[PDB]
Symmetry: C2
Subunit: 129 residues, 2 copies
């Protein structure tokens, strides 16, 4: 599997709510860097972090994807809109770009760039006019 | 000029503080979308917006760059750290990913993805 294919598979597995299968593609000591959040280290911690969002449907849409490097190793760049339906019925739609470093079908680092305030506001529950 | 070359040239001009030359590569009606900020429309408005930062030195470092499409048209994706020195000696280093749509050597859309909180924290006086 090429770097591009590895990330395409990762995103497909996330979109099938297969979080265990997706995280299987992360390296054991993966750096998972949501740029405005604390950094996460390792597959298990990445899996646990992702489960903090109680999602019942996930639709991470890829608008553009391209890779550096070769068949074995490279960095895959993505432009996305990450949609979630939560167990309580809340819908999220977060615009994000992400870079994925892949070596031999394993994601060694994953860096997602988005705005935290937008995320936090979408997570919030006259009170106002 | 290919999409990749257009964006490389744009970034080189930004890094030389040549904001007029950089903006010349933006379409007259460019969509300039700093994702967590108001959208800017057109070359003149993009030039004015970039001038809002009183920068005396600029170092936008491209860590990774890759393009979709063909020799004429496509989207260039970038992973960067955008560094600035301002007139009062304050510096900034904003981690950002950007997507640039190019057609025939003109950037028709530029979408930059970063955290507004981090930007505002660095602009703190």
């Amino acid at each position: 599997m090429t770097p591009l294919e590895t990330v395409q598979l990762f995103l497909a597995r996330v979109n099938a709510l297969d979080l265990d299968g997706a995280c299987a593609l992360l390296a054991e000591d993966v750096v998972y860097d949501n740029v405005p959040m604390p950094t996460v280290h390792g597959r298990a911690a990445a899996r646990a972090f992702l489960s903090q969002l109680p999602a019942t449907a996930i639709d991470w849409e890829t608008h553009a994807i391209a890779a550096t490097g070769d068949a074995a190793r490279g960095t895959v760049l993505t432009e996305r809109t990450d949609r979630f339906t939560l167990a309580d019925g809340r819908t999220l739609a977060i615009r994000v770009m992400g870079a994925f470093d892949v070596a031999d079908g394993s994601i060694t680092a994953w860096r997602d760039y988005f705005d935290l305030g937008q995320f936090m506001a979408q997570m919030a529950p006259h009170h106002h006019h």
